[model samples]
Target chain A: DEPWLKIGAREFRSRILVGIEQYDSVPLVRDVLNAAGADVFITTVDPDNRRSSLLLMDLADELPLDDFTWIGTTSFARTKESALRSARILRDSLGIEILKLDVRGDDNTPDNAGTVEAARELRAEGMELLPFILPDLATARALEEAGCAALRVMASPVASGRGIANPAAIRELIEQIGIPVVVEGGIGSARHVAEAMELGASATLVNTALVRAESPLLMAAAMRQAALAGLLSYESGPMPEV
Target chain B: EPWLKIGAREFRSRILVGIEQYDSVPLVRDVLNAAGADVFITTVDPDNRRSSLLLMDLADELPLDDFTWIGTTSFARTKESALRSARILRDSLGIEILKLDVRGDDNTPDNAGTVEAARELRAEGMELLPFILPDLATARALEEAGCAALRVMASPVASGRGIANPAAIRELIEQIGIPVVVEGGIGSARHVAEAMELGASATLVNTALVRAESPLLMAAAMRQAALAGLLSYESGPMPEVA
Candidate 1:
C-alpha cells in the first residue's frame, strides 16, 4: 500500500502539480489555477527575462493564497545559484513554499547537479524542491543521488509545445524511480491525463492542454474533475477486466 | 592598422548588425536595411514565448543579398529552438553568421550550451558567435573558443549619456584577443570615434542613433562615420610622441 509522499513538510495526497504557461490573461490564469485545484502552481523566473518574474509577482499580488496551497517558482535555464537566490526572494516575498528547480544543462556535465545543489539549499531553508527530469536513466540516478524531493517527468521540449517524451521513456522512468513520479507535458485530454496517473505517475502538470481549450475556464473545470476522478480510480485499485 | 577577427572572417569594421525590434513588421525592416547601410541587422525569431516568428520570418524575407549577412537573431529562449533556428538560417537560408543572444540569468552558464551548440552548427558552415557584455571572463572565453570575432562593449549603465567608453572597450580588447563591438548604449559620432580609438573593432547603435533628429539621414551619417572610423583605423595613427 502506497502512502502520500511528503514534499518539504507537506504531505501531498496526489503527485500532480499544475503550471500556468499559456493563459489569455491573469484572470484566465487564475481561473485555470482555481480549476486545477493544485497545491502548487509552478512558475518560472529569470533576471534576464524579467517578463516571467513580473507575471509571477503580478499573480501573487492578485490571487488569494487561500485558493492554492503553494506557489512553486520553477527556475529553468538558470544556474543553480541564480535559481536558488530567485526562489528564496520569491518565496519570502510571496510567502510561497515550494521551489521547482530546473537548471539548464550544465556545461560541465549532463547531470543536473546545479539543480540538486539549488534544491538542497532551498530545502535547508525549509522550502520544498520539485525538480524536472529528461527521462534518462542517468538523469534519474543523478537526481536520486542529489536527494531531490520528487521527480517531474517533463513531456514538452523545455518551454515549447512540441511533445518530446515517448511511451518507452515514460515506462523506463516509472520502472526505475522509487520516488514520487509526476507526469508532465503533452497531456491534452482527460484520457491522457488518466493514463499518465495509471502509469504510476503520482501527478501531472498541464497548462497548454487546458488553457488553449475553446472555453478555458470550462476546460479547467473539466480537467480538475478529470484529475480527481483519475486519482480516485487509481486509489480504488484494479477493476474487473471487461 | 588592426582588423577585427571573427572566426576566419576579418572585417576592418566593428559593427555587428540588427533588424528592428519594432516598426511595421517586414517592409519597415527592409526599409531599415536599405537605409541603415549595414551588412546585417540583429533580429529575433520567437519560439514558445509568443509566436512572433511570423514577424521574424517576414523580416527575414527582406532582400539582403545572398552573402550580405543577417548577424544575430534574439528571440530564441530554449536550447532546441535556438540550435534549430541557427542551423536553418545558416545552412538552408545561407546566413553566414549566428549570434547567440541567450536571454536568462546574467551569470547562469545556461548560455554555455547555446555556445557549444552554435559552434557545432557553425562547424558545419554557419559562423557562430556570442553576444556578451564587456566582462573580462566572457570576452576571454569567447575569444578562447576561437569562434567570436567581437564582444558587446556597453549597454548604457552609469554613463546615462548612452555612449561607449575607452575603459570598457580597452578591457574587452585586452581580454578577448578579438575585435570588440560597442552596442546598446551607443548614441553619437563622438561615441563612435571614441570607441574606435579605444580599440573597438566596430560599433552598433540602434534607438540612440537611429531615432535621433532624423532616422534615415542619421543612419546614413552613422554608416559614413563607421566607415570613416574603420578607414582611419586601417591607415595608422600618428605616434603619440608625448
Candidate 2:
C-alpha cells in the first residue's frame, strides 16, 4: 500500500493536492479533479468579492464534497475581522477545516512577520493551517513552531508558471524543516513535479499546469502518474555502490 | 574558457559517463558519443579479468583514445586487493586514471580503506580519484594524502533519485582545494546541470542515461544540459531576491 500523508488528525491516500482556479469553467474543475486522483482540493477565499471565481462554497453544490477534503485560503494581512470572518465562512459555509494563510502586506511579496503572528492566532482558533511562504529555513522553523499543519514552499514567484526557479534553496528548506514541505507555484510539467518530490517535498500544489494544458484531463492523469512515479522512485532508494 | 582539470590533464567538457547498463558495447559507445563526455569511467573486476579485458577491447574500438579512460576498482575490500586491482587497471587495461572505491566491512558501507588505497595508488604514479563520504575532515585528509581528485556522492550510486546531500557536497567544494566531481544519483539532464551549478568540476552518471526510456536522446540531452549548466554558472544567476 502507498504511504499515507498525515496532516494533523487527517490522513490522505494521495499526496497530490490540486488547486481549483483558472479553469475554463466550473465543470472543468470537477472533470480535472476526477482525472487527477488528488486526495484534496484547495480554493481561495476572496474577502473582497466573497463570490469570486475561486471561492469554494460556490462549487460545493455542484461537486461531491464527501469524495475529497477541501481547503480554504485567505490573506492573513487583512484586518482581524475580515480574516476571522473568512475563516468562519470556510468552516461554517463550506465546511473546510484546513486554512491556507498567505500573509500579505502592501505588495505581492510575502511578509514573514505577519505570517508568524497570524499562524499563532489562527492555530488558537482551532484551524489546521498551511502557510504559503518562501523557502527560508528561519521562516520554516517559525511556522512549524507556530503550529502549522504543513509549509507550502513557493517554487517560483507566486503563480508565474515557471518551472522551479530555485531548486537549491528549496532543497535546503526541505532538509532543515521537520514538518512536511508542500511545493507550490511555478511547476510546469511532470518533470518539475518529479524534481520537487526528489528534492524531498512531501506533496505538491499545482494549478496552471493542469488548467492551461491542451487537454486538462489528459494532463491531470499524467500528473497523477508523475507524482506516483516520483514518490516510488524516491522510496526505492539509491542503487547499491558497485 | 570553460575547462575542467584533474591531475596533470585539463578537459573542455564537464560530463563524465560511466560504461555500464547499456544493451551492447556499440550502444554504450553511441550513448557516450551522444553525451559528448570528456571522460568515460568503467570498473575493473579483478576476480573476472577476462570479462574486464573484453570490455576494454570493446571500449578501445570507440574514439576511445581522444577520451580519458578512468578505471574504477570495485569490491576492493582490503589494501592488498585494491593494489592488485590498481595494477591490473594500469598494466593490462592501460588506464592512466584510477577511481578507488574500497568498500568497508559488511557492518559499514563507508570506504574505510580509501585513504590507504589512494596513498598507495598515488605513490605508484596513478592519477587517484577517491570516492568519499561528505565528511569535511575525511575529505581534507584525502586531499593531503595526495589524491588527485575527489568524487562526492550526490545521493547513492545509480539510484536515479537526483542529488541527496547537496549541502554537504557544496560544503566539500568550498572547503577543499581540489576539484570535486559530483557522482551518482543523476536522474535527468537538469540533475547534471544542477551539479555544475553547485560548483562541481563535473558530474559522473550511469543509470539515469542507460536505463532511460530513450538512452540515446537522453544522452544527447545530458550533454546539452551539462554545457548549459556550465554556461549558466559562468553567466551567474540573478539575485535570489528581487
Candidate 3:
C-alpha cells in the first residue's frame, strides 16, 4: 500500500503542500505545481471582504482544479468572529474545505491565543482548520484539542527565506501533538524541506523556494524527490544518537 | 587569508571544532588535522584532577603552540564552580579562551549565571566566549560585561539539526559590537556555509564531524565549506529582497 497523509476526511499520497503565489503567470504556477507533485495547493483570501478572489486562485482557472485540492489561507483576523467569517467565505465561495488560519494582530508575531479561539469556532462550524503558529507546546495541544486538521509551525519569521531555524522546537511540537505537523516559512532549498521532514514534520509548505528559483519547475521536482527521500530516510530509522 | 579574532588573539581558521564525540585519540588527531581548525574547544573540570590530566596528555600529542586551547565549563550551577573551572583550565591547563556555559537544572542555559561567571573569568585575565540564548538584550548585557565574543545556539546544543533562529541571530549580529559566533545545529557542509553567510563570525561543530560516515573526510569538507562561506560573505551575495 502507498503511504498517505490524512487531513480531516481528505487523504493525500504526497505530503508536500505547494503554495501558489508571487508567480508572473498562471501557467507557470500550474507547471510548478504539477512538477512539484504536491498533495495540495494553497492560495490566500482577502481578510477584508472575504469575497475578493485571490490572484493565484483566479489564475488557477486555466488548470484542471480536480487534479489537486485547493487550500485557502488568511493571515489576517485577530478575533474569532472575523476568522470564522473568513473561513465560511473560503468554504462557500472558493469551495475550499481546508482553511489555513493565520490570525496575527500584526505581521511581526503570530497571535497564538487568538488562533486557538478561532480554531475552536471554525471547527464548530464544520470547517477543517489548519492554524499557522509558532512552536508553542501548550498552544499546539490547545489547537489539536480544538479539532485542527494540522499544525503549520512557522520555522522562521514571516517570508524571511532563511530556512529551518528551529528544528528543536519543531521536534518538540511534533512529539507533543497527535495532529500532523506541517513546517512553513523560510524554506529556500530542497535540503530545507528534507531537514524539516527529518525533524518529524509530516509535511512542508513552500513558496519562496519554488518562486525565487532560477527554474521553478526544476526546483519543484527537486523538492518532490527530496520530500520522498527524507520520508524514506526517516522511515528507515535515524542513526543511533552519539 | 582572513583571520578570526578572539580577544587579542587571532586565528587563521573560523571553524571551532569541539572534541567531544571522537572515540579515540588517533581518530581525534586525524579529524583535527583534516579540519585544519586553529581553535579547539573541549570540556574540563577542576574537581576531577585525573580527568584534567588526561586531557592535558591528549593536548601534548598535538601541536600545542600551533593551536589555541579553549576550555568549556561544565554544568556549573553556582558562581564558585564556574570560577574554579575557569581558573583550573587557565592556570593549570593553560587554556587561553574560556567558554562560559552555566546551565540550570533543566539543562537550559541561564544568562544571569553566564554573565556572572563571564565577569569573574574576564577579571582573572581570561578571554570569555559566553554561550547565550539568542536575545538582543541578553547579548548586549554579556558584551557590556566584557565578553570577548558571543556564542549563540543555532538550535539547542548539539541537536545537529541546523540553524533555528536566523532572524534573532541576525538581529544580534546587527546590534552587537563584537563577533557573534553560531554554535550547534551544524549537521553538514551546507549548514556551515549557511551559518557564515548569515553574518556569523564562525560556526562550531562536534556531532556533524564525529558522527559522520567518514569523520576525516567530513572534517576536511567542513573546513573547505567554512572558508568558502566566509569568502562568499566577503564577496557579497546578491540582495535577497528587491
Candidate 4:
C-alpha cells in the first residue's frame, strides 16, 4: 500500500506542497492550484500593517477554501521576536495552528539559530511548527529537541532553481531526523522532486519551480507524479550500483 | 496529445517493453497493458525457438497489432550470430524491426559489431534500432548508418540501477538527432520520468516490472510518470546556468 505523509496526527496523501506565491488572475491561480494536486500550501503572513494577513485569504474569494491546508510562515520577519509575534497574528488570521517557522538571513537563507528560538516559543505557546533550515544535523537536532513537528530542509538557496545542491547531505539529514523532513527550495523540475522523495523526504515544497515555469499547469502535474514516483521508487528498493 | 514519434512509427505511449524475466508469459500482457506500452522488444536466440516460443505464446495471447514487436540479439556474441538471430525472428515472426546488440569481450554492447550489423540490416530495408553503450561517436555512426533509433543502456540490464549518468544521458540525447529509446537498468517510475526529463524519446523496461511485488501497479505508475516527465520537461524551466 502506498503510504500517506503523517505529520502530528495529520495525514496528507499528496507529498507535494505548493507555495501560494506569484499572485495573478484568480482563475489562473485556481487552475494552477488544481493542477498541482497539492494537499498543503505554504503562504506568508506578515505581522505589521493590514495587507489581508495572508494572500490565501484573498484567494478564498476566488477559489474554494476547503479540502486544502495552508501553513503560514513569517520568513519576512528579520528577528526572532518579530517571527514569534507574526505567528500568533497568522494563526488568529487563518485559524490554523501550524506555522512554517523561519528567520531570514541577509541572503534570505534561513538563520537556523533564530528559527530554533522561534520554534521553541511557538511550540510552548501551543502552535505546531515546521521550521525550514539548511541540511545541518546539529540544527536539525536542536529543532527536533525543541518540539518542532517537522523540518523543512532547503535543496539550495531560495528560488535558485539549481535543484538539490547536495542530495548526499539531505539523505543523511532525513535518516537522522525523527520528525518528518520536507524538502524545499531550488526544486526546478519533476526530476528534482523525485530525487528528494527517493532520498526519503516525507514531502517537497515547490514554489519557483512551478511559478517560474513556462507552463505552471504542466509543471504542477509533473510535480504530483514525481512525488508519487519518488515515494514508490524509495519503497520499491533495489539499490543497484550507479 | 504529446505523441512519441520514432522514424515512421508514432505512439501515444512513451514506454517500450521487453518480454523477458516475467515469471509467466501471460502476465506480461497485463503489465504491458497497465503501462499502455506500444512498442515491445523480444529476444531472439540463435540456438532455439525457446525464445521464439515465448514470443509466439505472448504474440498469440495479446492482440496481434497491440504491440509493434521489435526483435533483439540476446544470445549472439558475434556480428554473424546476431544477424542470424535477427533474420530468424524476421522470417518466423515477420518482425521487420530489430535491435542490434553485438557483445564486447567485457559482455557490454560492442559498437564495432553493432554498427556493421546495423548497416547490413539497413541495407536489407529492415528498420534497425541498435543498442550500444553511451559512446558519442558510436551513437553518431549508428544514426548515420540509417538505423531507425538508438537503444542505449542507462546501466547494466536488470540491475534496477536507474540512469547511470545524468549528464551522459542528457549529452547523448542532445548530441544525437535520432530518437533515443533508453533501455536497461530502469527500476522505478522515477527512473522512467528521469529518462524522459533527460530528453529520451522513450524508455524500454523489463526486469523491474517483472520482478515487482505488484507489476501491474508499478506499470500503471510508470505509465503516468512517462506523461508527467514528458510534459514537465516540455514546460522548459530555466536551464542550469553554466
Candidate 5:
C-alpha cells in the first residue's frame, strides 16, 4: 500500500516519527528503534545541547538511516549558512532528506521566514523541508501557503502543556488546506492514535508517553504496531455506520 | 551539627520534596519506600492543571510527620484560601514551611500574589518558603518581595529534565541580599557540596539524589555530607598564615 504522506522527498509508510531523547543509553534507544522499525527518527540540533545531538549522530552511525526513508531534525536558528551546513550533514553524513525547521526569534513575529528562506535554499540544493505547525488555523494556513513539503500539526501549545487543537479544528484544517496534515503530541494509547488517523491526521508523532515507559522497547514495538494498524484501519476499512 | 534550621515552630532543611504522582498501589509504594528507606516524602491534593495543595494526610500510613519537615505545596489561588490552607497544614499537620507557587491568571504578571501570600502566612506565624526560576528579573523581584527563604532554580519546568544553574544561583545569592537557598536541577554530590561552599544558605534536591545508583544509601550519604558541610561552614576554618 502507498504511504500516508511524503516528508521532503521521502515517502513514509508510518506517520509515527520517533525521537531520541531521554534514553538511558544508546543501546536502549537502538533496541527500541529496532523493535519499532519506524520510518524516521527525529533529533533536534542545538550546539548548547551538543551532548544530545552527538548521541543521535553516534546512534545514526550504527543504524541504517538510508533504509528509514527520512530523518527529521529541528533547529532553534534558521540562517541560510546554518541550514546549508545542516543540510549537507544530513545528506552526506547521515544520508537523510527530511529537514524539520523550527525557527525561534526574540519577538512574537511569525519568525519562520528565516527557516522558509533556509528551506528554499535547501530545496535548491535538492533537500526536503518539513515544518512543524503549531495547532493554530492561521499558522497552518500560513505554512500551507509557504509551500512546505508537509505540515506537522502540534497537539499541544509549545512551552505550555495545554492541548490547543481538538478533533473539530484538525478536521477543519485538513479539509480546508491543500497540504498534508500530520498530527503530533500528547498521543497516548492505541485508541488515541487510531482516532487521530480517522480524523484526517495523515500521520502522528509521539515521544514522551511511549519512550519514557519502564519498558521502552516493548512500548516502542506497541507504538509501531499501533501506528501501522491505525494507518491500515484508515486506508482499507470502511467508514463506521453512525 | 544541625543541618536544618528551626524557626519558632518550623524547621528548614535542604530537601526539595515531591509526591510521586505515579505508583498505582499503596502496597507497591510501601515496598518501594521500605526498600528505598526514604526519611521523608511529599504528598499533594491536585486541584486542576493549574494548582495543587499538598496533603500530608495521604501519607498517614507512613510516619513522614515523625522523620522530616513537610514542605506544603501551593499555587496561585486567592490569598484567603492559600493563607488558611497554609495555616491549617502548619497548625494541624505540623508542616514546617509553605512553598508558595503563585502562577498568574494572565501570562503577564509575576508571582507578586505568592510573595504577598508568603508574607501573610509568615505574619500568621507560618514559615514562608518560596521557589523561583533563576533569571535576573525574577531574582530582583523575589528579593524585593521578601520571604523566609527563596530558591534559586527548580526543574521539570515542562518536563522532568534537570536545569541546574549554579553560576546564576551564586549571582542571585550575591544580589538578592538574603539567606538564599539553591534548589532543583542538582544531579550530583559535587553540585550539592559546591553550592554550600559558594554561600548558598541551603541546597534542596530530590531526583538526582533519590534516583541515583543507590537511592536509599545515597540519600543517607547526602544527608550526612550536607550536615557535615554546613557544620564546617558554621565552625569556620583556621586562619591562613599570611
Candidate 6:
C-alpha cells in the first residue's frame, strides 16, 4: 500500500505506465507488458488510426482492456476540438473515463494553451484526465486546478528519446506541482525513468524507448525496477548538486 | 605536411572523430579543434539521431570545407536498413562517403550485411569504408570490393578495454592492402599510441574524449599520442646500440 501510486479510485503497483503502441508483434507487446509489471497502460483510443489499428486488434485478442487498466490517448488529433471528439468517442465505445490529453501545435509541440482549455472542459463534463504538456509551470498548475488526475510532462521533444533534456526545469516542475507528475515522451532507457523518479515524478510513460528497443521485454523489466530504485533514491535523499 | 592518404583523399590529422554523444555543440567544437581531426564519423539513422545533428549545427561555425564527413549506419540492423539510412544521409547532408556498419545480434558490425552494403554503396560510387571482424577473409574481400579503408575494432565498441584483440589487429594491419583504421574501445592516450604503433593508418575515437575528465585535455593528449605512437613505429628499434 505504501508503494502504490494512487490516482483517483485506481491505484498502480508500478510507476511505469507504458504506451503500448507500435510493436512488431502481439507476443512482443504482451511479453513486454508482463515484464514491465505495470498495471496501467496508454493506448490510442482513436480507432481511425490505421497504424494503431492492426497491431492493436492483434494485441486485444491476447491482452485486452479487461487485463489492463488503460488510459485513452487521442493520437493524430491536431486541435482541442478533435482531441475532445476522440475522448468522447473513446468513452462512448470503450467506457474509458480517463484520458491523456494531447493537442499538438503547428510546430508539432504540445500546445499548452489548447490542452489547458481542453482539460478544464473535460473535467467540467466529469472526465478524469492527464494532460501531457511541455515543462511549463503555469500550464501544469492550470491543469492541476482544472482537476486533472496527473500531469504528463515531456522529458524532451516527443519521441526524441533524449531523456530529461533539462533536469533543472523538470526538478522545478515537480517541486511546484501539487498533484502527481508523470514524466513521459523521450524516456530512452531505465536510467532516464530513474532520473525522472529521482526528481520526484510519481510515474513515467514510455513508448519509443520500449518499441524501438532491441528487446522490449528486457527493457520494460529494467524500467519497472528503475522506477522503484529511483523513488528509493529520492526518498533516501542523495547529496545535493555542488 | 606529411598526411594520412587513402585512395583520393588525404587526411592532415591522424585522428578521426565520431561526433555523436557529446554534451554540446561547443564541446564538440572544442574537441575537434584540439584533436585537429578533419575526418568525422557520424551515425546516420532514419531520424538523424547522431552527431549529424551536431555537424549540421556546427556547419556555420566551422565550415566543412576542410572536413570529410563519413556517415555511418550505427543503429541499423539489416543491409536494407543500412542502405536506406545511407541514402537518407546522402539526401539530407549531401554526404556520400560512408562508414557502413549493420549491427549484428552482438551489437558489433554485422559481417555479411556490412560487406553487402559496402559493395552496393561502392558500386554506386560512394567513397566507402566498412568495419569488419578482424579476420583475413572478409578484410581481403572488402579491399577487393574497393573499400577505401577497412575499420577493425581495437575492442568492442564502448568496452573501453582497449586493444582486446592485438593479434587480430596486428594481422589485419600487416596483411590488408587498404588503409586500416582502428575504431572504438580506445579509452586512453596509450590506446591511441598502441593503435598507431600497430601501423594503423589512423584511429577513430568517440567515447574516450567525451567521457574523459576534461574533453579538451583528452583531445590534446590523444592528438599527441597518435603522433608519438606513429613516430615510435617509424623509429624502428629502441636500442641495439650497446
| TM-score of the second chain for every model | 0.67, 0.86, 0.87, 0.89, 0.59, 0.90
| CAPRI tier of model 5 | incorrect
- Alpha-carbon local distance difference test for all models: 0.54, 0.69, 0.71, 0.78, 0.53, 0.74
DockQ per candidate, 2 decimals:
0.01, 0.03, 0.03, 0.52, 0.01, 0.01
- Native contacts recovered by model 5: 0.00
Error of 6 at B205 (Å): 29
Q: A74-185, model 4: which lDDT tens digit per residue? A: 7667788898888898888667787878787878888888888878878887898889998899999998898788899999978788888998999998899898899998
Instruction: Output the number of the lDDT-best candidate.
Output: 4
Give per-residue CA lDDT, model 3, range B1-242, as digits (tens). 44456655676776777774444777666777888877656666557732322344557568866767688776477677778877777777687788788877755578787888887777777888888778888898888877778888887655666777777787788889988788866776656656766778877777777666666666665665565455445434324521
**Candidate 6, after superposition: displacement of residue A204 in Å?**
0.9
Residues B153-234 of candidate 5: C-alpha lDDT, one tens digit per residue: 6443322233355467657777776677666555433334445535676666555533454444344433433443343233
The deviation in Å at residue A67 for candidate 2 is 47
**Candidate 1 chain A lDDT trough over 10 residues, lowest sum:** A233-242
Off by over 4 Å in 3: A1-242, B1-3, B6-8, B20-23, B52-61
Query: For model 1, what TM-score is found for chain B?
Result: 0.67
Query: Can you tell me which runs of candidate 1 are displaced by over 4 Å?
Result: A1-3, A8-11, A14-16, A21-24, A43-64, A91-97, A105-114, A120-127, A158-164, A233-242, B1-242
Residue B146's lDDT in candidate 3: 76
List of clashing residue pairs for candidate 5: none
Query: DockQ (C-alpha) of model 3?
Result: 0.03
- Pairwise TM-score winner, candidates 3 and 6: 3
Tens digits of per-residue lDDT for model 1, B1-242: 33544445445434433444544565445434433433454444545333222324544565534224554556555566577666556554566666665545443224465566555665676555666555676566666666656546365421314343446656667666656677655553434444554556776665543344444444443444454344333333222200
lDDT ranking of the models: 4, 6, 3, 2, 1, 5
Clashes of 4: 0
TM-score of 3: 0.51
Q: Candidate 1's C-alpha lDDT? A: 0.54
For candidate 3, give the lDDT of residue A80: 59
- Looking at candidate 6 chain A, the ten consecutive residues that score lowest on lDDT are A233-242
Each candidate: fraction of true contacts kept?
0.00, 0.01, 0.00, 0.48, 0.00, 0.00
Number of colliding residue pairs in each model: 14, 1, 3, 0, 0, 0
